[PDB]
Amino acid sequence: RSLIVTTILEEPYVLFKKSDKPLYGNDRFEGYCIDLLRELSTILGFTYEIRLVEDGKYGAQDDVNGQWNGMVRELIDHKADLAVAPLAITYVREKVIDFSAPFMTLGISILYRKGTPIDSADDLAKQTKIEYGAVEDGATMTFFKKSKISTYDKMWAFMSSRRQSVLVKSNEEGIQRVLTSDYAFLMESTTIEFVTQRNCNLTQIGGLIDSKGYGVGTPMGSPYRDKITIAILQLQEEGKLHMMKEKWW
Amino acid sequence: SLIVTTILEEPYVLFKKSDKPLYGNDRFEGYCIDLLRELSTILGFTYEIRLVEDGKYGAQDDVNGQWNGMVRELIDHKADLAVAPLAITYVREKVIDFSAPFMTLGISILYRKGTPIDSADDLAKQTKIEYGAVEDGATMTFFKKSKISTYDKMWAFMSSRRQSVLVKSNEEGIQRVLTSDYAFLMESTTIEFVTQRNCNLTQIGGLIDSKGYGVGTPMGSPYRDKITIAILQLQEEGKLHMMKEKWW
Ligand SMILES: N[C@@H](CCC(=O)O)C(=O)O
Ligand SMILES: N[C@@H](CCC(=O)O)C(=O)O
Ligand code: NA
Ligand code: NA
């Protein structure tokens, strides 16, 4: 049977294809992760239906009742067979779903305007004039919430106390905030790279604060777990992942 | 106690130096040894380190398809884990399981500074400067299977001059760079260790591919997910980075 693939809108990984005429079904979507899905489909021989995650979330655990949401929850509940998205492979998620080998490596960094003295997270941490934040309840925010590093704990103290204002619903909103107020956005380096190639007044500040990968998510115990990993390694070795990144970035 | 297979390779695994005799696991040190200890602290297992009997990483004999090295030790359940700079590859993942990568790297070129050589293409288009790789490892396999004209040219050169340009270990290749006119195709992580200690050497060109090192387990291992979880925990805590800083 066809697989149900959950994903999320996020440039340039997954986007609505533009056209004068209305598109339907899988035709509606394009991007790095859609090319990835197409390549995986060819290797493994499955057909699929792409469905945007119903609640529009990546997947985090509620801090009161411990329940999962987002693409992670859709996999736990067997509402999707695969998640193919810029979904960070994390310790807490791997406890509830399985990730393939990573198809992209990245890390947290800072998006901000050019031509300022700010050169690092420490530079942000030690002031309050320039506000900073991250996507609410994503892997980036979780990094700061969990960190025992003085600088990062101080940044978490700042962000959490200003959660209503500095934590945003999406990368888009974070970028929109950088462009409209004195605001620096903590976000994933791969996505920063796409943003900065299209906004020449924006730049990455400093280097990578951590390291992680994006991987394809499957429900724990899926008969596809190892098949997907093997296919990802095939695409990696074929140089296809590199071509895909060059195409979309 | 879990049996852990590994392989000598600076600075991942090496014999510890001491004025006094050493015994058991205490004979070994290195990044992978520290990693193994960290995995044990998280997962709570005890273990015995054993160097891979045949001293090989793991490849398939092209004649009979037989595996060797640490890969074979896992397939045959002669070890419970492999903790080493073992590349996560397509052919290996079909017969054993790898964790999430604890390190990311790529093939590159180890050679001298100040030369006319600035890329793999520069090596491929000549024959005065010899070049090669570790026999039967992931790097050699990259070249063997490549459809890129530059890399297939390099494979033709290496496979014909096997006895002369392919080496048995990274240490042998590095000494070859240091003592003859030779460029060594090898993994960028290990190159960085070498260039920090040999100021006349440098990496040439960028990474030619991308891959990770992972902990290997036999398929069906009850430890597979717990190992990946622990690796991800060490990643997030910054502990893998600290270990890399320690050994490099
Ligand atoms: N890619 C992230 C969301 C964005 C972010 O946290 O920076 C995740 O998987 O949670
Ligand atoms: N680490 C490699 C061996 C060295 C190399 O091929 O450059 C492997 O896993 O096969
Ligand atoms: Na899992
Ligand atoms: Na496998």
Numbering used by the authors:
A (entry chain A): 431 to 544, 555, 566, 667 to 799
B (entry chain B): 432 to 544, 555, 566, 667 to 799
What does the literature reporting this entry say, word for word?
Desensitization of these ‘non-NMDA’ receptors involves rearrangement of a dimer formed by neighbouring ligand-binding domains (LBDs). The LBD is a clam-shell structure comprising an ‘upper’ (D1) and ‘lower’ (D2) lobe, with ligands bound between the two lobes, and the LBD dimer is formed by contacts across D1 lobes. Specifically, in KARs, additional contacts are formed at the dimer apex (grey surface), including a chloride ion bound on the twofold symmetry axis and two sodium ions bound on either side.
Consistent with this, we found that the K531A mutation results in slowly desensitizing responses with significant steady-state currents when either Glu or KA were applied to outside-out patches pulled from HEK cells expressing the mutant. In these mutants, both the R775 and D776 side chains adopt different conformations from GluK2 WT. In the GluK2 K531A and K531A-T779G LBD structures, in contrast, opposing R775 side chains adopt an anti-parallel interaction across the dimer twofold, whereas D776 forms an inter-protomer contact with the neighbouring sodium ion. The D776–sodium contact maintains this geometry, although with a slightly longer contact distance of 2.6–2.8 Å in K531A:Glu and 2.9–3.3 Å in K531A-T779G:Glu and :KA (unrestrained during refinement). Anomalous difference-Fourier electron density maps showed no peaks consistent with chloride binding for either K531A:Glu or K531A-T779G:Glu (data not shown). From the structural data, it therefore appears that truncation of K531, and the resulting loss of two positive charges from the dimer interface, disrupts chloride binding. For K531A:Glu and K531A:KA complexes, there were interface shifts of 5.1° and 6.8° compared with their WT counterparts. In K531A:Glu, in contrast, a 4.2° movement of D2 was required to match the WT:Glu conformation. When ranked by this sideways shift, Glu bound to K531A groups with partial agonists, whereas KA groups with full agonists. Despite its location away from the binding pocket, truncation of K531 affects the conformation of D2 relative to D1.
